[PDB]
Each structure stands twice: as C-alpha cells, then as structure tokens.
Amino acid sequence: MTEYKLVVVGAGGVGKSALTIQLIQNHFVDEYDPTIEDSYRKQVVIDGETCLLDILDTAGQEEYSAMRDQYMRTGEGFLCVFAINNTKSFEDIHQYIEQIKRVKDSDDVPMVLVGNKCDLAARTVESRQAQDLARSYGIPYIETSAKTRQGVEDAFYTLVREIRQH
Ligand SMILES: Nc1nc2c(ncn2[C@@H]2O[C@H](COP(=O)(O)OP(=O)(O)NP(=O)(O)O)[C@@H](O)[C@H]2O)c(=O)[nH]1
Ligand SMILES: [Ca+2]
Ligand SMILES: [Ca+2]
Ligand SMILES: [Mg+2]
C-alpha cells in the first residue's frame, strides 16, 4: 500500500508522543515518559484510500541532534509541534523547520505547524503569531489537544494531504 513517512518534531515536552499515542492508540498519556526514538506503523483509511502511516516519534532532547539529521533526511512529511503554553518551544520551532529545509535541501517539504495543548488555560502563544509563522513558511497551522483529541486527526491527516498534493 501507499506509505507516508511522517516525522513528529519539536521541543521536549510539547506533546509529540501524546499526539502520536492519541492518534494511533485513542488515549492520552498523562505522564512523564521522554522519547529517544519511537516508531508506529498503522494502516488507516484516509479519504477512501488504504495507506500505511509510518510515524517516527522523535526526541526533543537538547542533545541527540545528530540522530536528527538522519530522520529528517528519510522523513516525507513533518509535524512541527510546539505548546501554546510554552513560548520557548514556539521560538525553538523555527529552528526545526530550518533544519528540515537544510537537511532535505528543500523549502517545499510537506509540513504542518501544530500548536499543542490547546485545552490548557495559561496560553502564552497567540494563535495569530503561530499563523504568521506558518504563513511565512507556506504551511498550514493547526491547534491540537492530545488530552481531549481535539484537532489530532486533523493535524495528521492534513499532513498526509500535504504530501499527497505536493
Ligand atoms: N494538557 C495537556 N497536556 C499534554 C498534552 N500533550 C502532552 N501533554 C503532557 O505534557 C507532557 C509531555 O508530553 P510528551 O508527549 O511526552 O511530550 P514529548 O514532546 O513527546 N516529550 P519528549 O520530547 O521528551 O519525547 C506530559 O505530561 C503529557 O501528558 C496536551 O495536549 N494537553
Ligand atoms: Ca544542505
Ligand atoms: Ca521551492
Ligand atoms: Mg515523546
């Protein structure tokens, strides 16, 4: 079947694994469990087509930035996640996008900017500023909550569609 190599990237703690676990396993990891590198392969039906999601869940850890070039090379589409209650993760997310473009020698690589944790009250990143960043890059912006599942399928399936229409 058609396969989509998705990579989830972003600062530590933004909810990369929670987004993936919510998508693939229909539940929210309310727990501390840092990722090194994790891979999920789930066969889904998206707009009537059977396809294999091959999702690589990466580490936000401040080191491990050598293992990062290798999965950016192989990755087909990228979920670029920050948390709407963590301005630093937003500020850091431009650096991931830049590294994706450098490692893939392209600025037309399918990407979705994801503002996660949108259930929380103490938001520190306004949707308007996330909008501008996504617009400045030519990529959609989608807010998610891995806790309530809001926007989760939307974020991942839009990424698949960005790949399909690329
Ligand atoms: N309220 C809320 N908490 C969330 C959400 N997503 C993740 N969290 C919480 O935030 C923490 C970090 O989640 P996690 O998915 O492990 O983040 P990560 O980006 O995968 N971390 P790492 O880079 O270390 O692998 C956990 O306590 C998790 O339950 C969300 O959508 N809403
Ligand atoms: Ca290069
Ligand atoms: Ca181009
Ligand atoms: Mg994780």
From Swiss-Prot:
GTP binds at residues 13-18, 29-35, 59-60, 116-119, 145-147. Its EC number is 3.6.5.2. Changing E37G: No effect on interaction with PLCE1. Keywords: Acetylation, Cell membrane, Cytoplasm, Disease variant, Glycoprotein, Golgi apparatus, GTP-binding, Hydrolase, Isopeptide bond, Lipoprotein, Membrane, Methylation, Nucleotide-binding, Nucleus, Palmitate, Prenylation, Proto-oncogene, S-nitrosylation, Ubl conjugation. One of its GO terms (cellular component) is glutamatergic synapse. Palmitoylated by the ZDHHC9-GOLGA7 complex. A continuous cycle of de- and re-palmitoylation regulates rapid exchange between plasma membrane and Golgi. S-nitrosylated; critical for redox regulation. Important for stimulating guanine nucleotide exchange. No structural perturbation on nitrosylation. The modification S-nitrosocysteine is found at C118. Changing G12V: In CSTLO, bladder carcinoma and CMEMS; constitutively activated; interacts and recruits PLCE1 to plasma membrane. SMART domains: RAB, RAS, RHO. A motif (Effector region) lies at residues 32-40. GO terms for molecular function: G protein activity; GDP binding; GTP binding; GTPase activity; phospholipase C activator activity; protein-membrane adaptor activity. Widely expressed. The modification N-acetylmethionine is found at M1. PROSITE patterns: RAS. It catalyses: GTP + H2O = GDP + phosphate + H(+). Disulfide bonds: none annotated. The modification N-acetylthreonine is found at T2. It is a lipid-anchor. It is linked to Costello syndrome: A rare condition characterized by prenatally increased growth, postnatal growth deficiency, intellectual disability, distinctive facial appearance, cardiovascular abnormalities (typically pulmonic stenosis, hypertrophic cardiomyopathy and/or atrial tachycardia), tumor predisposition, skin and musculoskeletal abnormalities. NCBIfam families: small_GTP. Belongs to the small GTPase superfamily. Ras family. This is GTPase HRas. It comes from Homo sapiens (Human).
